[PDB]
From TrEMBL, chain A:
It comes from Staphylococcus phage 812. The lineage of its organism: Viruses, Duplodnaviria, Heunggongvirae, Uroviricota, Caudoviricetes. This is Uncharacterized protein.
From TrEMBL, chain C:
This is Uncharacterized protein. The chain holds residues 337 to 480 of 1152 of the full protein. It comes from the Viruses.
Length: 48, 96, 144, 96, 48
């Protein structure tokens, strides 16, 4: 399981996307952040 | 249950168990000492658009009443992501 | 060629196995839909019409494209410079809010632009004006 | 409705059976409290969700603060804060 | 009212009640709810 609870302001005329490249214990050995994409996560809300 | 001594328990409860996850439904009418599984089976009805409800009903003292009790759900699983989920415990102690 | 024992040409001989066929579209699965609205879903019907299917309780594995939904967090400001912010693209399950902090653009929730489509949904941790939504938090449990 | 429900409790010392009269008493759980939970039974391990009214198996809360690759990070690490790549500019000057 | 809602949903949920289950089930109508109105019986020459 996972959470994003990072903290920042995005002022107006700004933006802050949050992403991971998740290598898993559910994944093979060679699977690395090259093969992974920026997979996004929501702040102040729980994730699986 | 010295307020209403019970020969019977309806261990009605509600769980969405993912694949292979479990709850063991139990009593210890001896107040949490010997964890007896409910020996009369739950009516494992679908509760709603997800959960199963599990209506045990059982003469947990076979011979007059228990005046006291403990009851339980042994949440258990094969992996940390098949997670058993539980709500709406509905345990009438009963005298029937 | 490893040189053990072998059949004849005209001994009654054969081979047998479960084989992982590449199951074929329409031939080995049609697709059909079941559940709708807040429950709309698709089904690889291992063709009840046509199927060279597996044995019952022996594997199927499917590749497909499908539409992400998008959870477009929308917000409004001191003269309608709306942060119409297009959402995190994921399936509707956890199609997720970009949690914008432009200090003019107020938290209205999300126009969740629908998968294969355009529209809106709002099931969220997101909070609108000073929690006065409390009024309906109360009135809901009353109405239950 | 609360004082009509209070009036129902003012029937219910007297109500005629309500049941035929069979009810002993109910133990029940909605997974937003510690009071019916025997967390003192040390085998207990659920995570009630306190307006959500459901639980699952207890969790190992592995908190992490991410760490920064400062070159590939084009963002200027503004002290404790982190900010886009920038140059300065002299936005204001008084030269008298 | 939510303590009382948990008592009703879970402890009436647990019954040992009524004359056990003589009464099977209930329907109710204030003349108010779209889901209990049968306008699909367009026989519904009535207004709420």
């Amino acid at each position: 399981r996972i959470v994003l609870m990072s903290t920042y302001l995005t002022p107006e005329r700004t933006g802050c996307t949050w992403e991971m490249k998740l290598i898993l214990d559910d994944m093979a050995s060679s699977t690395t952040f090259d093969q992974l994409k920026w997979e996004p996560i929501g702040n102040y809300q729980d994730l699986d | 249950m010295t307020e209403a001594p019970y020969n019977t328990v309806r261990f009605s409860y509600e769980a969405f168990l993912p694949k292979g996850t479990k709850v063991v439904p139990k009593y210890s009418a001896d107040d949490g000492k010997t964890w007896k599984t409910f020996t009369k089976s739950p009516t494992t009805t679908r509760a709603n658009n997800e959960f199963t409800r599990y209506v045990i009903d059982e003469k947990v003292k076979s011979s007059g009443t228990n005046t006291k009790l403990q009851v339980r759900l042994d949440l258990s699983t094969e992996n940390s992501f098949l997670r058993p989920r539980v709500r709406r415990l509905m345990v009438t102690t009963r005298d029937e | 060629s490893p040189q053990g024992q072998e059949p004849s040409g005209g001994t009654s001989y054969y081979v047998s196995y479960k084989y992982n066929k590449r199951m074929e579209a329409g031939k080995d699965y049609e697709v059909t839909t079941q559940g709708e609205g807040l429950s709309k879903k698709w089904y690889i019907n291992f063709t009840p019409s046509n199927g060279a299917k597996p044995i019952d309780q022996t594997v199927v594995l499917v590749d497909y494209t499908y539409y992400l939904a998008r959870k477009d967090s929308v917000f409004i400001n001191k003269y309608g410079d709306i942060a119409i912010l297009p959402g995190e693209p994921n399936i509707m399950r956890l199609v997720t809010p970009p949690l914008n902090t432009d200090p003019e653009n107020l938290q209205l929730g999300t126009v969740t632009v629908l998968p294969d489509s355009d529209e809106a949904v709002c099931i969220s941790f997101a909070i609108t004006r000073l929690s006065m939504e409390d009024l309906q938090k109360v009135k809901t449990r009353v109405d239950n | 409705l609360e004082y009509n429900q209070a009036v129902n409790a003012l029937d219910d010392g007297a109500m005629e059976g309500q049941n035929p009269l069979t009810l002993r008493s109910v133990f029940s759980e909605g997974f937003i409290s510690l009071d019916k939970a025997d967390i003192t039974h040390p085998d207990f391990g659920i995570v009630f969700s306190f307006e959500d009214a459901e639980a699952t198996l207890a969790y190992t809360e592995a908190v992490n603060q991410p760490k920064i690759i400062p070159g590939d990070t084009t963002a200027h690490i503004w002290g404790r804060l982190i900010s886009a790549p920038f140059t300065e500019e002299r936005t204001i000057y008084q030269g008298q």
